[PDB]
Amino acid sequence: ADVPAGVQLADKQTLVRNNGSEVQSLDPHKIEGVPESNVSRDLFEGLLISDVEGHPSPGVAEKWENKDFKVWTFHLRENAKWSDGTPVTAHDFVYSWQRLADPNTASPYASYLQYGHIANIDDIIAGKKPATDLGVKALDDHTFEVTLSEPVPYFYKLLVHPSVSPVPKSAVEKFGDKWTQPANIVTNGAYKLKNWVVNERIVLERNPQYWDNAKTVINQVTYLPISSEVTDVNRYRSGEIDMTYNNMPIELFQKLKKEIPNEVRVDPYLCTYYYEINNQKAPFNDVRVRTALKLALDRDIIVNKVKNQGDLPAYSYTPPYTDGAKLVEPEWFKWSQQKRNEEAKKLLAEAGFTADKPLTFDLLYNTSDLHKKLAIAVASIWKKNLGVNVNLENQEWKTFLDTRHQGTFDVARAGWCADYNEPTSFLNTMLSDSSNNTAHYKSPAFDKLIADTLKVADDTQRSELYAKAEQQLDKDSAIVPVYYYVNARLVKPWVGGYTGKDPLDNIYVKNLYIIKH
User: Which Cys pairs are S-S linked?
Assistant: First the structure.
């Protein structure tokens, strides 16, 4: 943390943050969501980290170079250590990236190594080559060298993500799936795990071995798992919580902007809220059905009337303000809702559905006040505009994500946030073979457009290709885009160091501080 000259620090440097739900895991190779990553950034540090404004910056690597954007060499700082005092080395990175690639680990982010195009990853994921063939090596204890199969000028931007953080081999091998318990875990970020009570709290304490420990100010941070945005706001206003999670309740938000304006933080955020259709399950394998659902949803009602929190109606997967996005707004988005409704009714009528044999399906969402209220609104809208019936189903976060990977669903409430600011952070998740493809969308045309982006050495050709890949996704109605999120949350006046400038919202508690109050 960089405490401004003249700020008076509180005697007690503790923080309580709501984290939206109980985490899937604390193992960097078993996680894929925002709540998981929130805790992961305090505990495990990779090659690079985001600074307080989101810029990729030195993490365990103090400096790095690249040869033709294909061979990347990372110089690890000599004093990077784990919480047990042992050195973090390039061997840790070699083991960890191999463990991420290994199919036996079954990471949801195994494809992150495909997104960076590390040599031999496709064969490794497919079981054709052992994980030890991955294009990574330790040239010495403080030098990690990554070899890619093609030039990737933005490669280093990927490296702030939890999936490419180091994990301690000795703890993993000795304790298996209990390596992350407080008595066994070993961490290399600013914090260490103190307590973990499922569905109650995660408590982290400063890690004195952290190389940058002298600049850490907060001594203890607690992450809560509250999925009700109403309860989060209530426990923030009671004094328990210092920073809510960044999902705001429809019940209270308008009142909050009038009651505590300065605490309501609203900043750009590279995330898209959408309804994820399971493209492999009939009748959702029919484009007419998916297009009808996409067109009949009234984004103006949802975004401006039922939610009204500053979000922008969406017509694509990649947010249009992602660095490198130059998207073509489709003609259907400019039409009137009535015109979209008739086209939708027409397509479902064409698909075989009638008043006596209507389309009925499930709408799965993770337990939440906000998602439940939006799903009820969406159900009413679809009922009124298209005559379809939906059965709402809530599931807790960890179970919800497993369901989407299993494909045991029809339509699911979804949100994707960028992991690095470049359109492929979104687009790569729709590749046929992506470990993140919960839409179960498989388009050889889409795959080809993205493969072609690194075969050119020009930004304009790349942007044009991303635009066409989005048009392909749209023509197939792989998803139902709803809105581009804003990052809205409450933060107490005494929490310093939170700019809201990072569109990825990669917060590190090591950068915050509590002002005397």
Answer: 271-417
Q: In this structure, are residues 396 and 365 in contact, taking their beta carbons and an 8 Å threshold?
A: no
Please name which of 154, 456, 156, 272 lies closest in space to residue 464, comparing C-alpha atoms.
456
Question: Which residues touch 288 (CB under 8 Å, ≥6 apart)?
Answer: 347, 348, 350, 351
362 within 8 A of 221, measured Cβ to Cβ: no
**Angle between the 369-386 and 287-296 helix axes, to the nearest 10 degrees?**
110
Q: Which residue shows structure tokens 């660095």?
A: 323
Q: Can you read off the two tokens belonging to residue 221?
A: 């941070």
Number of residues in the chain:
517
- Identify residue 108 by its one-letter amino acid code: P
Distance separating alpha carbons of residues 484 and 225, to the nearest angstrom: 24
In three state form, how does the secondary structure of 61-78 look? EEEEEEECCCEEEEEECC
The CATH superfamily of 1-44+169-270+487-517 is Periplasmic binding protein-like II (3.40.190.10)
Residues 403/262, Cβ–Cβ less than 8 Å: no
3-class SS of residue 294: helix
In 3-state terms, what secondary structure has residue 183? coil
Architecture of domain 271-486: Roll (3.10)
Tokens of 50: 């985001």
Q: Spell out the residues 6+ positions from residue 54 whose beta carbon is closer than 8 angstroms to its own.
A: 421, 501, 502, 503, 504, 506
* DSSP calls for 254-276: HHHHHH-GGGEEEEEEEEEEEEE
Looking up tokens 């399950």 gives 281
Cα three-residue angle 431-420-370, rounded to 5 degrees: 85
Q: Judge contact between 205 and 194, C-beta under 8 A.
A: yes
Angle between helix axes 229-237 and 369-386 (nearest 10 degrees) is 140
Query: Which residues are 314's β-sheet partners?
Result: none
- For residue 455, give both structure tokens: 């075969």
The secondary structure of 360-426, three-state, reads EEEEEEECCHHHHHHHHHHHHHHHHHHCCEEEEEEECHHHHHHHHHHCCCCEEEEEEECCCCCCHHH
CATH class, range 45-168: alpha beta
